[PDB]
Amino acid sequence: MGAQDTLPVAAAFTETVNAYFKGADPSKCIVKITGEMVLSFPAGITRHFANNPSPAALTFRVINFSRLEHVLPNPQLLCCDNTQNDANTKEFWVNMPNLMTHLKKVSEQKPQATYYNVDMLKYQVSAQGIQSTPLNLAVNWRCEPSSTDLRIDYKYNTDAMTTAVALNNVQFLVPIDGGVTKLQAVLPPAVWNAEQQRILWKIPDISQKSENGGVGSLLARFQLSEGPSKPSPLVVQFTSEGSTLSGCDIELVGAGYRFSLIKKRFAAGKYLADN
Ligand SMILES: [Zn+2]
Ligand SMILES: [Zn+2]
Ligand SMILES: [Zn+2]
Ligand SMILES: [Zn+2]
Ligand SMILES: [Zn+2]
Ligand SMILES: [Zn+2]
Ligand SMILES: [Zn+2]
């Protein structure tokens, strides 16, 4: 009635996992997880009680901050608390004039948009080799001058994510050299693309709940006209929603704002496996 509005803001932690597997030797697995924290602001609002009295401070705390190996806050929009009484959380103050400036500008440049996203934090999540990959991979090739056999073994890895959630739209793509004429063996079903000379398996979901507890194999045998094939990296895609790999969370400090939603998701970035 005479009260400072609560202002609606959305938050997102979006993380990307890059992994390289080599044969079945977990020691040579190389993992890099990057991420960003994005704040989204509803249309044009910008000032919703900013004049008299002053606009509410937008301040937030990142929970489980120590899980991040490296962090780069947006230098135009944020300052934070030093120290670093390493208490695992970190408080950030948003520069309100620079935010108002910023939210006015894109509103002029994306004027038909309902919402404006702002990159608040870019980061890298501490990883520990294969333990940190959500989908462990191992690939093996047998290259005959006249034939090629391919096996890919995968395992859903529970302990890579803060909460156990499914990997969605999982794709396994492998280019097959050597002039394939036909595939004479394949399991489970896959698609062979003659134009790009590569095979593709799609699995809708992979989790603890999956038919095999998320452990499985992909097998194919190819007949060649101009072999041998040379092993090429398997390239994998997947996305997941409802969890991060970091386990970081976000909370508001003081009044003025409410998180309409805090989205957490991760997806494979460059996610490869060599023979
Ligand atoms: Zn209002
Ligand atoms: Zn580093
Ligand atoms: Zn500041
Ligand atoms: Zn700082
Ligand atoms: Zn700007
Ligand atoms: Zn970005
Ligand atoms: Zn709290």
Numbering used by the authors: 554 to 828
Give sentences copied directly from the paper behind this entry.
Thus, the SGIP1/FCHo1/FCHo2 μHD is a domain designed for recognizing the locally ordered structure formed by the two consecutive DPF motifs.
To gain further insights into the mechanism of DPF-motif recognition by the μHD, we solved the crystal structures of the SGIP1 μHD in two different space groups. The structure of the SGIP1 μHD adopts a topology similar to those of the previously determined μHD structures. Among these distinctive features, the most prominent one is the presence of the SGIP1/FCHo1/FCHo2-specific insertion of a relatively long α-helix (α2) between β6 and β7.
